[PDB]
Amino acid sequence: MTSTVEFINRWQRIALLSQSLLELAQRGEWDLLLQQEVSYLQSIETVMEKQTPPGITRSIQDMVAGYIKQTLDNEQLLKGLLQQRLDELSSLIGQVLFQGPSAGLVPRGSGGIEGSIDETVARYKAQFTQLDTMMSKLNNTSSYLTQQFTAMNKS
């Protein structure tokens, strides 16, 4: 049973990853969080593009029910935590990034503005976009994950 075994291993990844990158999110380890991001979201994507096989026994269903439950909790805690972070970063970008006003000239050289402004913008914009694409995908995932959870657990 190939479909069934790869199902097991990847849901195992999803729950272990969400838990550990949550430890990293509350620690403020953004570097480590984003290293886990790609593997985590991609694991959720590849199980749902593969689609849950009908050949899942009661033992395997109970395992992955636990795995989805873990990843829902952790990813909901990511949702709230990263909403705080992105809001702060966005408010910083709203000051440091001169999109026209607050400036004598229009700094049109995006990704190469003359001055240390380019550096502080590049930092906040990178951290924002990374945790933001993480958020949009993790909110989409936790959506179809909890729907699949309620069905897979109690059809």
Q: Count Cβ atoms within 10 A of the Cβ of residue 94 and give its class: 0-12 exposed, 13-18 middle, 19 or more buried.
A: exposed
CB neighbour list of residue 109: distance below 8 Å, 6 or more residues apart: 118
Task: Give DSSP secondary structure letters for 123-138.
Answer: HHHHHHHHHHHHHHHH
Which residue, among 82, 84, 83, 78, has the nearest Cα to 40 in the 3D structure? 78
User: Whole-angstrom distance between the N-terminal and C-terminal Cα of the chain?
Assistant: 23
Distance of alpha carbon 151 from alpha carbon 124, whole angstroms: 40
Q: What technique solved it? A: NMR
Q: Are 40 and 14 in contact (CB under 8 A)?
A: yes
Every domain of the chain and the residues it spans: 1-155
Distance of alpha carbon 69 from alpha carbon 86, whole angstroms: 25
Which residue, among 8, 7, 145, 154, has the nearest Cα to 76 in the 3D structure? 145
Helix (H, G, I), strand (E, B) or coil at 102: strand
Distance of alpha carbon 86 from alpha carbon 128, whole angstroms: 6
